[PDB]
Amino acid sequence: FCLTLQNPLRKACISIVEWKPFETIILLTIFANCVALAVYLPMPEDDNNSLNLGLEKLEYFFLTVFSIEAAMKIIAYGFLFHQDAYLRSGWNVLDFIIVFLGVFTAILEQVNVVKALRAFRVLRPLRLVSGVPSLQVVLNSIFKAMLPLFHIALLVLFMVIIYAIIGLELFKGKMHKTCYYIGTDIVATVENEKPSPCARTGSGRPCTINGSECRGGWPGPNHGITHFDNFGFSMLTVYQCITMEGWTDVLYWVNDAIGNEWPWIYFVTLILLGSFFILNLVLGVLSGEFTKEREKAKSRGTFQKLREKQQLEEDLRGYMSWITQGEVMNRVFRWKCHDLVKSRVFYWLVILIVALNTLSIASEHHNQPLWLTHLQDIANRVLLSLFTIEMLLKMYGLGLRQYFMSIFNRFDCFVVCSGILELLLVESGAMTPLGISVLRCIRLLRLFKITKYWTSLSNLVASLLNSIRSIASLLLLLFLFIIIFALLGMQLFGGRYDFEDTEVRRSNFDNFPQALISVFQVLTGEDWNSVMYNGIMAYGGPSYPGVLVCIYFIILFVCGNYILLNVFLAIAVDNLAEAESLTSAQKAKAEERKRRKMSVRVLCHRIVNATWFTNFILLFILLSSAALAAEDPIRAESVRNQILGYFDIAFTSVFTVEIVLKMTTYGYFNILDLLVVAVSLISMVVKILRVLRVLRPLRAINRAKGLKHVVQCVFVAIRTIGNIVLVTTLLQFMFACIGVQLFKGKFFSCNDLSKMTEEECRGYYYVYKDGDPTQMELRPRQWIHNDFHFDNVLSAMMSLFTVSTFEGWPQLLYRAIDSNEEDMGPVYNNRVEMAIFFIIYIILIAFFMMNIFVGFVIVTFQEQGETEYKNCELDKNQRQCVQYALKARPLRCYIPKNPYQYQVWYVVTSSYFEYLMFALIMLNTICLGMQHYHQSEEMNHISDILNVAFTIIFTLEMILKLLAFKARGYFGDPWNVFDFLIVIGSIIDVILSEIDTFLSAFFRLFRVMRLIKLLSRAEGVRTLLWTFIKSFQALPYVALLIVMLFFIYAVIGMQMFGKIALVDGTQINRNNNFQTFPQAVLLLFRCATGEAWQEILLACSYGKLCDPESDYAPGEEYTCGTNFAYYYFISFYMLCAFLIINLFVAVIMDNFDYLTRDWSILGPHHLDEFKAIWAEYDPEAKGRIKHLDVVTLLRRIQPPLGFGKFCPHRVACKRLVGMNMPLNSDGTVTFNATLFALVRTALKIKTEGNFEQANEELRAIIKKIWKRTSMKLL
């Protein structure tokens, strides 16, 4: 704010004017500009209205102000080295780039007296954030957590590439055939089927439309967006499957192409690998990054601020009662109402009239009886009095000064007043036609009074409200991020959905309210592919300019779901840490209070004691189960179902013998193993006993010692968690009861949308196919009720659960926005303000209230990592680090002899060779991405040549890498074992290809799998893959509950839902079904990812028609399915979600050391580089090296462990000697304590004398003896 190369003030006075409101008169100016973009209404094909013609003048006015002021800051400074300076701060580079490109589009639009340069105009709400420096530390809290997620993002990119070149080579050009009406170009479907690929005499679906034939002139399955037949459309359709919206459409379109049995392994392996497993790494690095910063907020000063001011507040509220209870004390009558209140008579009988108010509210429903209408005005008039009695008792009988001091009594006086507001307003004839129900929505506040009865989360609800200058500083910056993308898509896509189809694309970008709703839907992830397909068909199509629209919705979905993880996860982590530590400090505050006031048989055991017997039971449990697996649902008479039915009596020989044998030696888990055979013997209603036969696996978690341990750790984690799960189900219940006041009776609708009520919705009507007004067909019209609706509290909670998950919530948003009146069909964009119900519900539940479940688990499983306390001399890192130095073992590197052979060896392992082969692999990928569909023949041959040309080269790196290591050393390094595997199968790719032309697809995949050798160099990524793959193998039991839970739910599902017929057009079709056990498991997987599971649920509920290969008494075709489907599917979604974030959190808490490593100080990545240079002197292990080597060995080490960047004549001549070391012979010094000695200089500096007490901390902190302390003490 000075010059140094300054110009006199005459022109420098300007600097004075810049004082306090000068910044805020132009910060007020820009909020007027943001409204000036939000009322611009985009209109198609160069059309306008009056208000956009008076706004373009306004743009000119706005531009000038920015320019005048962005000229009066470079000359409020001065010269060229003073506008050099203003620019210097990067916040004023954006402020110049906007307003210079601002006047550029006032010029070029006035020369042609363009519209893609009218979209830099949307960047001006960022100029708003440079003005408030309070938010510049908030963006820099989001950008600062992105440099750790670097090595994850690079790993997603070598999987979106790998599955693209796999999916190119297999799936290219297959999906170009559809059923067509004979001799037309009209594609044939059923009413509710989207058009799919078919095959002629293959394994695909044969066309079965009647008068339909299968031909190949078809462009693709979503107009040609999602196919696999060049590298850009293979990479766009794989990226779609990773985000898990509509991966089961790509899977089922391949099953109607090439066939049914092989392509499932592509989509399932991919989904798990790039979705359920990347999302494990993202929630580990991010979880560890938010924990290493709370330690650096512990270590600056910030702990006392939420402790002192907390305890300065509760001592302030307590010191107020020591005066104000003596401001009052005036009869016996004013005292006996004080003994009344604090007694348990009152706190257990005011909870009686809260429960009368819930039951009054939770009995509203549509078409309710006239008595229960009349009852609820009596019970409102009563419960308004009983709240008013206990307020007038409270405002006088204990004084109005204690009353106002409370946080919760402030609510009560309002509720009594706002309840008596209604009985004065509605008893007037001043009914106010909408406010007669708004004040019915008001009295819904009375059930928020029950929140006071928790008193278990009021260390979190307290800790919440301490952070609401910080909660809201993030929910603003998310809310600013939408308003750029809300308004960018009003440019690109406003108007522009001017299709001539008769279908509705309601998630469009026409207004500002609508654009905002659309942007949000793509952030919840739900159905964003439809919003993207419309943006590609809004431009040309699947062409070269039209498809770069697709990178709007990639920057939108990636970088917008990145902000969601930096807010909800962080809030739940930082806010949860305080709500726990303060409760754990109310531990130590309270137990220090309570101590002040106090102060033949014998053969049989051997027979079932032997290991073989225990294992003999297990392969009869692993076989008893897998006969339920292969059982036929549809036929109770099959030759298979008989020959598997004999195993019901063939396995209950052995499980009958053992239970008699068990009860000789003896006489909880034990009774179930009797109970399994009990059902298995009585089954030798008949149907309902087969269901209880499913528990044959559950008698296998009595046998394993490991399987008992996991199910007990899960039941621990419900007794903890089951405080949050109950509060949500209270808050779920409130929003359910608003929805019955808004949307009750309103979700009826006729069949054609012209008939508004039920009396008119009779008779028949026309439908027009493809909107041709010549191709019409009768249908009867019928008044259909919606499926998921809000009509009582029970169905309103059914609907809310689905929205909370994120499935099918836009079809409830539009059924609500279009909602008209009481018993009447819809009206287009009637209530566009009722998008706030479904957004406030989602922001509360599905992004926040749920974020406390994971945050809670992550935090309270660092308490299982903190009920074990090891307060020795050594810090855990030191101790963990120390553990390294004891338990090591050197490597083998097999440096050769025979200097012919050596002459290869140095040339191979040099980095100008590692660059050479890691360029040829990079070139070999580009040749595989060149392949495409309807390519020419001059590519067909140079495809096949380079298939031979590369294969010879990676052969010739393998003959050389045999010569240098002489075989024994080549098969020691397991990348070379994989490299041997690739070289062979690549040769068989050549030979098997040519011998057909000289006279299968699997060996084409050894051309793509050679890319995985990139992992042999990325030490930052190969460590990250190793550390998370180490710990899926280390927890093989939690991943066997999820295996077991899919097994049980499939077999019950095959049982009840197995006879639903495969009509096509519904959700039980030839791709989705419970008619085998692989079909069922696959179906369960669809629901665990949440594809259309609520739309599956409706498709298997009693009404559905049975297949004819079943049997039934005829006249009962429409009888199968059952209303057990609601219990089946809602229970499955809640158990699987619990058992997955179980397995997610357990993997984080093994890598809790890596994830929070703090790379600066000392780690094993330094300690790896010891054994690297230790390999340089011992080729094979053999213990020791010479003493002269340790002179030269030590300069090879980085100064965070070794010696500095100085010339080592001063320290190393001393530190090698003056620091103690084990003294072996003249040419011997051991491996392990050499490593122990050099970390001891870095960490744990101990003086002379502690050579045995440092073996005392190395023998009490230590475990098993490991008697090598003789070579590790001194």
């Binding site: 090591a888 073992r889 083998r892 193998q1033 280390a1034």
Partner: protein, 46 residues
């Protein structure tokens, strides 16, 4: 005109099912282990 098998298909599509599955198991049983701990390395002495 059908296709049917009671000998060769179920032996050769057992021999495939044998040899593909045993060699992979033989492969996993001579590669060392996932190192589980920051000092171990595949290919470490003995």
């Amino acid at each position: 005109i059908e296709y049917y098998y009671s000998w060769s298909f179920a032996c050769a599509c057992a021999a495939f099912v044998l040899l593909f599955l045993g060699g992979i198991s033989l492969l996993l049983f001579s590669l060392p282990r996932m190192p589980q701990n920051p000092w171990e390395s595949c290919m470490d002495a003995e």
